[PDB]
Amino acid sequence: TYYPPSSFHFLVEFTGIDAKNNDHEFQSVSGLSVDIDTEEFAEGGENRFKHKFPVKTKYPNLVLKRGVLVDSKVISWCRDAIEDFEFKPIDLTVKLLNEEHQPLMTWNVVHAYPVKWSVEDFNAQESKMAIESVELSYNYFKTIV
Amino acid sequence: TYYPPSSFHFLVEFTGIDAKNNDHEFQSVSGLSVDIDTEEFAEGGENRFKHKFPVKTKYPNLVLKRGVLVDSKVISWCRDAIEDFEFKPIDLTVKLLNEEHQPLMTWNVVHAYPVKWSVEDFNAQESKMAIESVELSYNYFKTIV
Amino acid sequence: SEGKLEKLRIVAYKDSKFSDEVENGEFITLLNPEKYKFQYRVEQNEDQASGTSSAPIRFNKILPQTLEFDFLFDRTGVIAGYEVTEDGIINDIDHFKKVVYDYNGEKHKPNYL
Amino acid sequence: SEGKLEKLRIVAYKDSKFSDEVENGEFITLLNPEKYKFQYRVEQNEDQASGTSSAPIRFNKILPQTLEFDFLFDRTGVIAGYEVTEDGIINDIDHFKKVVYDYNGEKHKPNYLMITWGSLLFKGYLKEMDIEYKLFRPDGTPIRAMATTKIGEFVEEELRTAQENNQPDMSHYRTVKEGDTLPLMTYRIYGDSKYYLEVAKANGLTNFRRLKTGTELIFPPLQKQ
């Protein structure tokens, strides 16, 4: 913009999971990008370049981090998939906020489910917070702005 | 030259997309280079070297970076290709400028289209600007100088 | 016209002297093949008697030749010079098969190429 | 309805004209194949004598066509639009086999098949099938399987002669344009210039060495036995 916005003020909301204020707060969000797979072809007589063709649109997994929370609803949902193969996809909204705490821009993440859950190593000789990490697979996203 | 020019003053212009002043300003440009693929052959009796032959001219993708802009025309164009497989290639000009803000040298980029779009990770504990990145595929380029 | 990129063509014919063209029987490609390949074979007679150290190999005949190549059809919209069609590649493949494959009831055979 | 994702269908038929449907004999897939493939073969006769540099080539036959594709069955619960079933994929595979594989006692054979998806329309017979079972519930109910298929091509014999409109055996008519001669036109119709006096007698022509440029002529067929 004339002065572009910073990246440290944002909100993560879930649809299909009971809401709690402690499940909307995160330390970091990553994975909001996309790419197109292509193929190459050489045409006889054309020596200046090879041709390139698109094939598929590709998205990476969405990664969320925060300090450990013991009564999380999101984690209970993750456990049902992890332990029993019960899968029930959800939708999600990522919001980048302005100074009035209203959205500048949002991302609509469609049909997501859990593929990973972990907690970082313990160390008796270091002063650190216990950090939890969750990774989700989804089909695509759209933006609103 | 006697005193070679610096690299921090330049302009990116698009043909086929409605113009806005905010879409001509970028933080960084990269990918303006080329190479030739070759093959090798060993001739019996010649023990001093192998022969090498050219096959094809090759170009890398063009990469543009800037702070996040919410109403960009270039991004709307990228979305049509990304979301619906509607492809409509454009031409582009890269200009390296002098002190009168006129071109020292330009690059003519031919038949380009979008293959990638991303925004860097958010971090609640760091003071940073949100940065956007766009990558384009093209056939070749020519220079004027 | 050195600078013109020539495109490969295939024409169908009615007679064995190649002078009478099939009507609407010409195919022009939109992308050239990368390469093509030929094959040549000569056959000899190699019978010999036992107890001997070599045979004087004899000429038999020269076998027919062979050509091979590959094609690509694409109407996605990233190749300069062409337009996107409402029905894609449906009419390109149907015209290609009518020239090189289909049986002709006037001559009781497929076409000369 | 451009925006609709069409799904591949297979219907079973009772007769060789494809007009009498088998009751409850239609299969619709839930996931489309990635690709499909065709095969075409033409056979020639290539006998030649010794001492020669080339053979005299003669057309022999056009061989039947072939179609191949692969399928995936899955009822795990991550694909949008579908529900998880109590018995998984058991009824999906049993209905697929009843259409394409099973023997029909009314006709003493398996079924005629029509395969349609978008631009594709193919009639024929199943030749080969392989089914591999991949995931299971703890009580042994399958929830994922993969199938490979090969289809042959069927043409009824009355339709083959109508598509091969085989024509010195039939009758013909032309109109005379300026530049035409009678022995050149006879060569292009019969293969020989020597029949020009029989064409002129069948049309009542006396001055056949000059044709007038609006005349319609007949060309009778050659006699047999």
Burial of D114 (0-12, 13-18, 19+ CB in 10 A): middle
Which DSSP letter does residue A43 get? P
For residue D51, list chain C residues with Cβ-Cβ distance below 8 A. Answer: 59, 61
CA torsion sign for D84, D86, D92, D93 is positive
If DSSP states are collapsed to H, E and C, what string results for B61-103? Answer: CEEEEEECCCCCHHHHHHHHHHHHCCCCCEEEEEEEECCCCCE
Find the helix or strand (DSSP H, E) in which B114 lies.
strand B103-119
Tell me the C-alpha to C-alpha distance, in Å, between residue C62 and each of A104, C44, D57.
78, 9, 14
> Which token pair is D128?
């080969």
Cβ distance A113 to D78 less than 8 Å, yes or no, reads yes
Please, which experimental method was used? cryo-EM
Quick count: other Cβ atoms within 10 Å of Cβ D160? 10
Structure tokens at D157: 């014999």
Q: Using the structure block, give the residue that is written with the tokens 């030259």.
A: B1
Interchain contact A139–D (C-beta under 8 A): yes
Nearest to B66 by CA among B12, B131, B134, B135: B131
Do D44 and D60 form a contact (C-beta atoms < 8 A)? yes
Structure tokens at A49: 């370049």
Select the residue of A33, A35, A48 nearest B115 (Cβ to Cβ): A35
Q: Give D77's contacts in chain A (Cβ within 8 Å).
A: 87-88
Alpha carbon distance B90, B16 (integer Å) = 6
Q: 């970028």: which residue's tokens?
A: B26
- CA-wise closest residue to C91 among C35, C36, C24, C22: C24
* Residue D65, amino acid: Q
**DSSP category for residue A22:** G
Neighbours of D52 (CB within 10 A): 11
- CA–CA dist A142, D102 (Å, integer): 47
Q: How far apart are CA C36 and CA B7, in angstroms?
A: 47
Q: Measured between CA atoms, how close is C2 to chain D, in angstroms?
A: 36
Chain D residues with CB under 8 Å of C61 CB are: 48-53
Q: Which of A8, A54, A104 lies nearest to residue B123, judging by beta carbons?
A: A8
Asked whether the beta carbons of A42 and A50 are under 8 A apart, the reply is yes
The alpha-helical segments, DSSP class H, found in D53-173 are 90-100, 157-163
